[PDB]
Amino acid sequence: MIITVASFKGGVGKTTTAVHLSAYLALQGETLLIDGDPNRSATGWGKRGSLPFKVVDERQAAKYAPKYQNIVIDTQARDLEALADGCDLLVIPSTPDALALDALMLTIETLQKLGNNRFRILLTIIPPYPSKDGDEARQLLTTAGLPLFKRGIKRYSAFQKASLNGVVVSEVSDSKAGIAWSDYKATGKEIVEEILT
Amino acid sequence: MIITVASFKGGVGKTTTAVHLSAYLALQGETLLIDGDPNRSATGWGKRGSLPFKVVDERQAAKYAPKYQNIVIDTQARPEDEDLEALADGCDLLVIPSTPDALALDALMLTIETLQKLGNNRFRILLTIIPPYPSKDGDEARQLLTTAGLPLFKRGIKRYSAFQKASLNGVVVSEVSDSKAGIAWSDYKATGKEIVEEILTLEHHH
Numbered sequence: 001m002i003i004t005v006a007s008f009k010g011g012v013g014k015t016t017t018a019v020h021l022s023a024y025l026a027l028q029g030e031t032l033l034i035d036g037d038p039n040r041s042a043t044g045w046g047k048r049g050s051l052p053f054k055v056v057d058e059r060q061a062a063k064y065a066p067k068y069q070n071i072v073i074d075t076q077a078r079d080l081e082a083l084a085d086g087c088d089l090l091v092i093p094s095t096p097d098a099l100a101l102d103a104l105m106l107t108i109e110t111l112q113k114l115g116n117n118r119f120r121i122l123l124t125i126i127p128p129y130p131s132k133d134g135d136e137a138r139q140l141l142t143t144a145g146l147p148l149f150k151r152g153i154k155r156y157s158a159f160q161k162a163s164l165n166g167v168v169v170s171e172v173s174d175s176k177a178g179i180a181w182s183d184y185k186a187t188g189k190e191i192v193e194e195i196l197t
Numbered sequence: 198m199i200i201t202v203a204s205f206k207g208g209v210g211k212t213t214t215a216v217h218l219s220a221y222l223a224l225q226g227e228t229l230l231i232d233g234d235p236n237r238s239a240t241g242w243g244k245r246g247s248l249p250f251k252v253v254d255e256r257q258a259a260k261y262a263p264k265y266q267n268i269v270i271d272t273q274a275r276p277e278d279e280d281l282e283a284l285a286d287g288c289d290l291l292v293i294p295s296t297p298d299a300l301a302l303d304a305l306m307l308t309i310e311t312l313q314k315l316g317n318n319r320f321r322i323l324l325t326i327i328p329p330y331p332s333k334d335g336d337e338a339r340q341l342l343t344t345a346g347l348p349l350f351k352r353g354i355k356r357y358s359a360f361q362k363a364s365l366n367g368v369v370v371s372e373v374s375d376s377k378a379g380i381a382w383s384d385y386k387a388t389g390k391e392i393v394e395e396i397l398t399l400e401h402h403h
């Protein structure tokens with residue numbers, strides 16, 4: 001099963017989602033995370049501590065891809081046609097802010113003329129409750145007839161401590177660990193019960 | 198069996214070598230060319246006519262790779278860190294094309310020091326579009342690389358106008374309507390044979 005996480009602006013949480021989406025699939029089958037992010041943030045992340053899946057470089061995609069039942073591809077949206085055709089679900093992370101969402105919206109025209117259940121937008125790094133950036137973003141894209149995940153990935157320190165320690169957030173010493181994981185686990189759940197349909 | 202053709206400059210016949218190294222390998226198994234060149238010239242060489250192998254985009258490498266016996270990847274090197282270590286690990290041999298001129302070699306020189314760290318039978322350097330007997334760019338470049346200790350393909354690709362016709366009609370150089378179609382393909386045949394032979398020794402995987 002191949003899912004590509006592809007984004008229109010840096011600092012979306014794209015890598016973090018690819019890592020968390022691969023830790024999810026790992027629980028169910030053997031999983032490769034392929035790193036096509038020019039910064040190779042994913043490879044650092046695996047080296048820095050450890051991770052319940054092999055991570056390899058985009059250049060190693062053809063060599064290692066036949067070995068794995070689950071593949072998560074981490075990459076920069078550069079052509080949105082090509083990413084879709086290479087996977088079962090294209091996940092596009094976006095943060096709630098006007099600047100990031102506009103970067104998403106200039107692309108609206110390609111995204112429409114593309115296919116309903118071929119991709120899906122994941123709102124990430126959502127500011128916590130006293131704040132409504134979350135919902136307002138949801139409505140903009142919904143208003144835009146642009147398919148979205150039931151849930152979003154809320155903003156937590158935990159996810160940072162996790163880049164730093166080179167582990168999945170579920171493993172980190174923070175009281176939002178479980179809640180942070182649960183955001184991704186829920187996304188896992190909907191991909192798998194989106195893609196097996 | 199996977200080989201990567203990677204270059205350090207545009208206009209060195211990388212794509213052209215990838216396309217022709219694929220035709221070679223289509224001879225032994227079903228083969229995929231994965232186009233990872235931003236100009237996607239290879240994908241386009243495909244559409245223009247009919248090549249004897251399947252060409253996909255690099256975004257489709259994970260999806261398509263498990264269905265093929267042989268893979269050629271066509272990619273520009275692109276520095277960010279050790280893009281050399283891991284280009285070599287994605288393939289059975291990294292073929293690295295160069296023309297014999299000043300600035301092509303000059304780009305090749307930037308890398309010789311990292312290329313020397315790589316070990317000796319992970320890659321090998323193919324001299325391409327060698328100008329004909331009259332001028333001797335070809336042999337100087339070979340002296341240059343031989344002195345700096347880099348491994349090279351015994352033979353090099355000559356400049357034949359034919360390679361170009363092969364491009365515009367979208368067919369491999371032999372299919373082309375031209376007097377040295379043959380002589381130009383035997384160049385790739387020799388290159389291919391030396392690849393397949395290198396991958397298959399006990400030294401190779403040491």
Ligand SMILES: Nc1ncnc2c1ncn2[C@@H]1O[C@H](COP(=O)(O)OP(=O)(O)O)[C@@H](O)[C@H]1O
Pocket residue numbers: 007009010011012013014015016017041124125126153154155156157158159160161163
């Ligand atoms: N849900 C989140 N909550 C808090 N911080 C996050 C979250 N997702 C990512 N980050 C942080 O944002 C920064 C950039 O994330 P990253 O995934 O690297 O973005 P990009 O995918 O665009 O590469 C990192 O320092 C990471 O710790």
Ligand SMILES: Nc1ncnc2c1ncn2[C@@H]1O[C@H](COP(=O)(O)OP(=O)(O)O)[C@@H](O)[C@H]1O
Pocket residue numbers: 204206207208209210211212213214238325326327354355356357358359360361362364
């Ligand atoms: N051996 C050759 N003889 C004549 N022309 C060649 C040869 N190799 C490549 N060319 C020409 O050079 C042009 C571009 O080279 P290309 O193969 O696209 O280089 P690169 O892979 O680095 O892009 C092509 O139009 C092709 O006609």
